[PDB]
Design an enzyme around this catalytic site. Structure first.
Site, PDB file in Angstrom:
ATOM      1  N   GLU A  16      -6.984  -0.035  -4.593  1.00 31.66           N
ATOM      2  CA  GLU A  16      -7.121  -0.065  -3.002  1.00 31.66           C
ATOM      3  C   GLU A  16      -8.356  -0.951  -2.773  1.00 31.66           C
ATOM      4  OE1 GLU A  16      -6.016   4.002  -1.864  1.00 31.66           O
ATOM      5  OE2 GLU A  16      -4.299   3.605  -3.117  1.00 31.66           O
ATOM      6  N   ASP A  45       0.774  -1.139   0.024  1.00 32.07           N
ATOM      7  CA  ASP A  45       0.058   0.028   0.095  1.00 32.07           C
ATOM      8  C   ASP A  45       1.041   1.269   0.110  1.00 32.07           C
ATOM      9  OD1 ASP A  45      -1.850   2.086   0.773  1.00 32.07           O
ATOM     10  OD2 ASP A  45      -2.339   1.358   2.747  1.00 32.07           O
ATOM     11  N   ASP A  79     -13.279   4.300   3.128  1.00 26.08           N
ATOM     12  CA  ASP A  79     -11.957   4.376   3.438  1.00 26.08           C
ATOM     13  C   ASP A  79     -11.589   5.864   3.603  1.00 26.08           C
ATOM     14  OD1 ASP A  79      -9.194   4.467   3.178  1.00 26.08           O
ATOM     15  OD2 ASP A  79      -8.996   3.432   1.354  1.00 26.08           O
ATOM     16  N   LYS A  91       2.034  11.513  -3.882  1.00 29.81           N
ATOM     17  CA  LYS A  91       0.806  10.781  -4.597  1.00 29.81           C
ATOM     18  C   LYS A  91       0.090  11.824  -5.125  1.00 29.81           C
ATOM     19  CE  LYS A  91      -2.319   7.043  -3.627  1.00 29.81           C
ATOM     20  NZ  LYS A  91      -2.321   6.025  -2.749  1.00 29.81           N
TER      21      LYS A  91
HETATM   22  N1  LIG Z   1      -6.095   4.195  16.162  1.00 34.44           N
HETATM   23  C1  LIG Z   1      -6.614   5.491  15.327  1.00 34.44           C
HETATM   24  N2  LIG Z   1      -7.353   6.312  15.402  1.00 34.44           N
HETATM   25  C2  LIG Z   1      -7.656   7.498  14.797  1.00 34.44           C
HETATM   26  N3  LIG Z   1      -7.036   7.624  13.822  1.00 34.44           N
HETATM   27  C3  LIG Z   1      -5.783   6.657  13.632  1.00 34.44           C
HETATM   28  C4  LIG Z   1      -5.615   5.559  14.333  1.00 34.44           C
HETATM   29  N4  LIG Z   1      -4.637   5.050  13.669  1.00 34.44           N
HETATM   30  C5  LIG Z   1      -4.003   5.585  12.517  1.00 34.44           C
HETATM   31  N5  LIG Z   1      -4.803   6.882  12.423  1.00 34.44           N
HETATM   32  C6  LIG Z   1      -4.891   7.880  11.624  1.00 34.44           C
HETATM   33  O1  LIG Z   1      -5.074   7.364   9.993  1.00 34.44           O
HETATM   34  C7  LIG Z   1      -4.276   8.225   9.462  1.00 34.44           C
HETATM   35  C8  LIG Z   1      -3.594   7.453   8.267  1.00 34.44           C
HETATM   36  O2  LIG Z   1      -4.252   6.654   7.487  1.00 34.44           O
HETATM   37  P1  LIG Z   1      -3.434   5.232   6.918  1.00 34.44           P
HETATM   38  O3  LIG Z   1      -4.660   4.590   6.140  1.00 34.44           O
HETATM   39  O4  LIG Z   1      -2.568   4.562   7.604  1.00 34.44           O
HETATM   40  O5  LIG Z   1      -2.712   6.057   5.716  1.00 34.44           O
HETATM   41  P2  LIG Z   1      -3.016   6.542   4.328  1.00 34.44           P
HETATM   42  O6  LIG Z   1      -4.267   7.801   4.613  1.00 34.44           O
HETATM   43  O7  LIG Z   1      -1.820   7.019   3.583  1.00 34.44           O
HETATM   44  O8  LIG Z   1      -3.618   5.668   3.487  1.00 34.44           O
HETATM   45  C9  LIG Z   1      -3.452   9.302  10.107  1.00 34.44           C
HETATM   46  O9  LIG Z   1      -4.377  10.461  10.032  1.00 34.44           O
HETATM   47  C10 LIG Z   1      -3.426   8.767  11.401  1.00 34.44           C
HETATM   48  O10 LIG Z   1      -3.521   9.485  12.479  1.00 34.44           O
HETATM   49  O1  VO4 Z   2      -3.048   6.593  -0.119  1.00 31.12           O
HETATM   50  V1  VO4 Z   2      -4.825   6.822  -0.076  1.00 31.12           V
HETATM   51  O2  VO4 Z   2      -4.954   8.692   0.197  1.00 31.12           O
HETATM   52  O3  VO4 Z   2      -5.650   6.715  -1.793  1.00 31.12           O
HETATM   53  O4  VO4 Z   2      -5.795   6.044   1.408  1.00 31.12           O
HETATM   54 MG   LIG Z   3      -5.115   4.767   2.475  1.00 37.16          MG
HETATM   55 NA    NA Z   4      -1.993   3.731   3.705  1.00 35.11          NA
HETATM   56 NA    NA Z   5      -8.092   6.893   1.522  1.00 28.35          NA
END
Ligand SMILES: Nc1ncnc2c1ncn2[C@@H]1O[C@H](COP(=O)(O)OP(=O)(O)O)[C@@H](O)[C@H]1O
Ligand code: VO4
Ligand SMILES: [Mg+2]
Ligand code: NA
Ligand code: NA
EC number: 3.6.4.10
Length: 381
Positions: free
Chosen positions: A172, A7, A196, A68
Site C-alpha cells: 500500500e 486496493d 494512512d 482482511k
Molecule cells: N471526506 C471524508 N472525510 C472524513 N472521512 C472520510 C471521508 N471520506 C471517507 N472517509 C472515511 O474513510 C474511511 C475509509 O477509508 P478508506 O481508505 O476508503 O478505506 P480503508 O480504511 O479500507 O483503506 C471511512 O471511515 C470513511 O468514513
Molecule cells: O485496507 V487498510 O486497513 O491496510 O488501509
Molecule cells: Mg486503506
Molecule cells: Na481502501
Molecule cells: Na490504513
C-alpha cells in the site's frame, strides 16, 4: 486485456485502470468510487459491497466484514482470538485455519478469509468490467507493508479464486508513492512519509526510494484506529442527546443505531468540506424524527485526543528510521480519514508547515498506484 489496480481495503475497496495516459478510478453501480468490503448471506442470495453493508442491522450474524484481519492467519493467533470477541459473525476452527461460519440459503456454510475476500474481488472485477465493456483478468492487488508471506499468499489466492491473474502483490505505501511518481524524480534518494488513516487502521510508513528500490525504513501506527472510531464518538454523542431530549435509550435497537451511524458517517464526510452538517432521520425510534446538526468544531472536540494521538506513531516511525522531520522529502496522505481538515493541519504543523501530497483523493491513492503498476507489468506504460 486491460490490467487493473485493486486496493483490497480493510473497510473499503477501490479499483482503477490506467488508460490513455491517466488513471481512471472506476465508480460502482451506485456511482460510488469505493465499495465496502462487506459480504452478506441471506435465504436467497449472496450480497457484496453496498448491498451487503445496507442490510447489516437486519442480518448481522450472516454479514461478514474485516476478512482482511483474518486473511493469512491461524485460528489460535492472539490477534484472531481477540478480534473474534467483537464480530457479530461466527469464526470457527478448521484444522488450524479460521473460517467464518454463516447461514446461507437455509444451510450452514463456512468460508476461509480468502474466499470472503475473493467475493469482494469478484465485485471489484465486475465493477471494472461494467465500465470497460471488456473482460478484466490481470490485476495488481495491494496489501499493508507489514503483511507476511502467509497474508500475501492468501490475498493472491483471493484473487485467483475470483478469476483474477494477480500480476503482483504490492505494498500500500509503495502504491501511494508510485501514484505521486516519487520514484521518478531527478535526483538520488527520496525519504517519503506515508500517513494512512483509513476506516479501521492507521499506518505510518517511511520509505527511502532510490534506483527503483522502495526500502521500508520503518512502520508504525494502530491496527484498531480509523474512521470507525470517529463515527463511534459521534454515535455516542447523539445517543446521549436523544436520551436527554426524549427519555429513550435507543442503544439496543440495532436498526435505529445503524441508521444513526449511517447519518453520522455521512455528516463526518460533509464536515471535511463544510463547517457544519445536518443530521436528518425520519422515525429514528418509535416514529420520532431526529433532525439536528453538528459543527466541525464539535466533531473535532469529540475526537480531539484521537486526532492528536496520530502524531505519536509519526514520531515513532521517524526515530526508528533514524531521520529528523526535516529529512522527509515528501509527505503523502492516504486513506479516507486524511480528508479531515484537523488531521491535515495537525500533520502539516508537525512538519512545521511543509506541504502535503493530497491532490489524489486519499481513499483512492492506493488503487491509483496499483493501476499504474498494473499497466507497467502488462506493457501498457
Ligand atoms: N471526506 C471524508 N472525510 C472524513 N472521512 C472520510 C471521508 N471520506 C471517507 N472517509 C472515511 O474513510 C474511511 C475509509 O477509508 P478508506 O481508505 O476508503 O478505506 P480503508 O480504511 O479500507 O483503506 C471511512 O471511515 C470513511 O468514513
Ligand atoms: O485496507 V487498510 O486497513 O491496510 O488501509
Ligand atoms: Mg486503506
Ligand atoms: Na481502501
Ligand atoms: Na490504513
Amino acid at each position: 486485456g486491460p490490467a487493473v489496480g485493486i486496493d483490497l481495503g480493510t473497510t473499503y475497496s477501490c479499483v482503477g485502470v490506467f488508460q490513455h495516459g491517466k488513471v481512471e478510478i472506476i465508480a460502482n453501480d451506485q456511482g460510488n468510487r469505493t465499495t465496502p468490503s462487506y459480504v452478506a448471506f441471506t435465504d436467497t442470495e449472496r450480497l457484496i459491497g453496498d448491498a451487503a453493508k445496507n442490510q447489516v442491522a437486519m442480518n448481522p450474524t450472516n454479514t461478514v466484514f474485516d476478512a482482511k484481519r483474518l486473511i493469512g492467519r491461524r485460528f489460535d493467533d492472539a490477534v484472531v482470538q481477540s478480534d473474534m470477541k467483537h464480530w457479530p459473525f461466527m469464526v470457527v476452527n478448521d484444522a488450524g485455519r479460521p473460517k467464518v461460519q454463516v447461514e446461507y440459503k437455509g444451510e450452514t456454510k463456512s468460508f476461509y478469509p480468502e474466499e470472503v475476500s475473493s467475493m469482494v474481488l469478484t465485485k471489484m472485477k465486475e465493477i471494472a468490467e461494467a465500465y470497460l465493456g471488456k473482460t478484466v483478468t490481470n490485476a495488481v492487488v495491494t496489501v499493508p507493508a507489514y503483511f507476511n508471506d502467509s497474508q500475501r499468499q492468501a490475498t493472491k489466492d483471493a484473487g485467483t479464486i475470483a478469476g483474477l491473474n494477480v500480476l503482483r502483490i504490492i505494498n500500500e505505501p509503495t502504491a501511494a508513492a508510485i501514484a505521486y511518481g516519487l520514484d521518478k524524480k531527478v535526483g538520488a534518494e527520496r525519504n517519503v512519509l506515508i500517513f494512512d488513516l483509513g476506516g479501521g487502521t492507521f499506518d505510518v510508513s517511511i520509505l527511502t526510494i532510490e534506483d527503483g528500490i522502495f526500502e521500508v525504513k520503518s512502520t508504525a501506527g494502530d491496527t484498531h484506529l480509523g474512521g470507525e472510531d470517529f463515527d463511534n464518538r459521534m454515535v455516542n454523542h447523539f445517543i446521549a442527546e436523544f436520551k436527554r431530549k426524549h427519555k429513550k435509550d435507543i442503544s439496543e435497537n440495532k436498526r435505529a443505531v445503524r441508521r444513526l451511524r449511517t447519518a453520522c458517517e455521512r455528516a463526518k464526510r460533509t464536515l471535511s468540506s463544510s463547517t457544519q452538517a445536518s443530521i436528518e432521520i425520519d422515525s429514528l425510534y418509535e416514529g420520532i424524527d431526529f433532525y439536528t446538526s453538528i459543527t466541525r468544531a464539535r466533531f473535532e472536540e469529540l475526537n480531539a485526543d484521537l486526532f492528536r494521538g496520530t502524531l505519536d506513531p509519526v514520531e515513532k516511525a521517524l526515530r526508528d528510521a533514524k531521520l529528523d522531520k526535516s529529512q522527509i522529502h515528501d509527505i503523502v496522505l492516504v486513506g479516507g480519514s486524511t480528508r479531515i481538515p484537523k488531521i491535515q493541519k495537525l500533520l502539516q504543523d508537525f512538519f512545521n508547515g511543509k506541504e502535503l501530497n493530497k491532490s489524489i483523493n486519499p481513499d483512492e491513492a492506493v488503487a491509483y498506484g496499483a493501476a499504474v503498476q498494473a499497466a507497467i507489468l502488462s506493457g501498457d506504460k
